[PDB]
């Protein structure tokens, strides 16, 4: 019953690989249910074509903002933003898919995939999914990041959907 979504990542047009995730809708519903419905394209907007604007080697990969493509907005399925579901799940290690909010109770479409144990985020960022396959794809696309987040190259979600 736990959704599984995927991302087909490209580096400057050239297809690179696939990254799937397991959405924990069992524990974090409104958040998980949110990510699934945007990974598919179930409303017209979603993550297809959007990119990872903020990648920081050894930390995480930020994406989910299809509107502004910088970090400003990005709408969810419930109009614009939504409250923090909970903090039951903690950023235990790399692969951990979490929401990239801007001050409590402001979750939209921005998420980040962890590339290391990031405990300091526990309690501030709503964890809701985890890379199932492709953590080596997220590693490659990580190399194309920097320190302030600037991408050394254009990383994109060339295609996305639900396989389960």
């Amino acid at each position: 019953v736990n959704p599984t979504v995927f991302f087909d990542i490209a580096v400057d047009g050239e297809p690179l690989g696939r990254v799937s995730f397991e959405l924990f809708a069992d524990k974090v519903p409104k958040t998980a249910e949110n990510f699934r419905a945007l990974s598919t394209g179930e409303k017209g907007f979603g993550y297809k074509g959007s990119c990872f604007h903020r990648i920081i080697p050894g930390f995480m990969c930020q994406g989910g903002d299809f509107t502004r493509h910088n970090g400003t907005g990005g709408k969810s399925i419930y109009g614009e933003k939504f409250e923090d579901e909970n903090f039951i799940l903690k950023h235990t290690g790399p692969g951990i898919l979490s929401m990239a909010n801007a001050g409590p109770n402001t979750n939209g479409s921005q998420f980040f995939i962890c590339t290391a144990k990031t405990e300091w985020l526990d309690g501030k960022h709503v964890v809701f999914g985890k890379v199932k396959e492709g953590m080596n794809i997220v590693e490659a696309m990580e190399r194309f990041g920097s320190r302030n987040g600037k991408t050394s190259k254009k990383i994109t979600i060339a295609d996305c959907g639900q396989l389960e």
């Binding site: 920081i56 930020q62 979490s98 990239a100 801007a102 921005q110 985020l121």
Partner: peptide, 6 residues
């Protein structure tokens, strides 16, 4: 902007 810090 949105996003977690290190």
């Amino acid at each position: 902007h949105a996003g977690p810090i290190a």
